[PDB]
Design a protein around this ligand. Structure first.
Ligand SMILES: *[C@@H]1O[C@H](CO)[C@@H](O)[C@H](O)[C@H]1NC(C)=O
Lengths: 249, 31, 17
């Protein structure tokens, strides 16, 4: 997270850290949507241009963590993966269209003060909140500039009108993405950055006081560049795939 | 299919406490 | 005021991240 601040304890209890088992290394962010299922970006697992192809036995997730290197026993839980699922029309060649993946845990995790799932949006919630100028919250342990933090970072960012998003990049934007961040004339700054991929973009519904995951940190050009914006997987548009995956398996 | 208790943080919403920046979200939705 | 992306269901070096 660039230009963010330290998270409060239990502020983002759906945060998941994705680690490679051996050698141990922080790979990505992720989010908890049930006691067995974790949502993340497809490019965290499969990205052929970098010879990246992680399968279930290469990975672990850490849930309930607040420090980044410390092993917080009794406060965090480490879970193995039973299976991963990459969107079958995920497009790594051109633009990361449908940058989404599900991971099923080998055992269900017990919820606690530090572990609790985030909601997925329904149609009324998405239409109400996914508007230009409305702010969401991004969290991660990624780099602060294009150093690394000691505690999970958090930053609030406004959704940007889609015509401005398109004009900002040469990549062809699909309907499965939106972009967020401050415009050059707005004074405030902030962005996701390398290592924040796969983490959630969340918004709090004024209608029922619940936090909803609207996006997945997908890609951007640099971090926090004037006139450039971070792009996010449009979770609502892909919600039927998520339900299809969870319902069959 | 969505779990009934999702999106309500034990240490905040469940205790009727707000975090240091969530008002900034709500203000962007209203103002 | 404007949607940041369509509210409907999916039918069917890219960045430095
Ligand atoms: C990923 O690696 C596995 C090895 O477990 C292999 O069977 C599979 O074909 C690979 N997938 C690719 C390269 O898309």
């Amino acid at each position: 997270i660039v230009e963010g601040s330290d998270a409060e304890i239990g502020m983002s209890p759906w945060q998941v850290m994705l680690f490679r088992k051996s050698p141990q290394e922080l790979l990505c962010g992720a989010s908890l949507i049930s006691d067995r299922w974790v949502l993340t970006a497809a490019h965290c697992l499969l990205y052929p241009p970098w010879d990246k192809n992680f399968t279930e036995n290469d990975l672990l997730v850490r849930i309930g963590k607040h420090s980044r290197t410390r092993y917080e026993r009794n406060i965090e839980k480490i879970s193995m993966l039973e299976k991963i699922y990459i969107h079958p029309r995920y497009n790594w060649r051109e633009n990361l269209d449908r940058d989404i993946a599900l991971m099923k845990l080998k055992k269900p995790v017990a919820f606690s003060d530090y572990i609790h799932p985030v909601c997925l949006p329904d149609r009324e919630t998405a239409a109400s909140l996914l508007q230009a100028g409305y702010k969401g919250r991004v969290t991660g342990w990624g780099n602060l500039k294009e150093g690394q933090p000691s505690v999970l970072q958090v930053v609030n960012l406004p959704i940007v009108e889609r015509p401005v998003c398109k004009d900002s990049t040469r990549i062809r934007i699909t309907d499965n993405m939106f972009c967020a961040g401050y415009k050059p004339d707005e004074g405030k700054r902030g962005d996701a950055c390398e290592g924040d991929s796969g983490g959630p973009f969340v918004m709090k519904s004024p209608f029922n006081n619940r936090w909803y995951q609207m996006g997945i940190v997908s890609w951007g050009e640099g971090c926090d560049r004037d006139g450039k914006y971070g792009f996010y997987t449009h979770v609502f548009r892909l919600k039927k795939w998520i339900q299809k995956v969870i319902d069959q398996f | 299919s969505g779990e009934a208790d999702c999106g309500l943080r034990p240490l905040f919403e469940k205790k009727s406490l707000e975090d240091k920046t969530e008002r900034e979200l709500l203000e962007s939705y209203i103002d | 005021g404007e949607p940041g992306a369509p509210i409907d269901y999916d039918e069917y070096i890219p960045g430095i991240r």
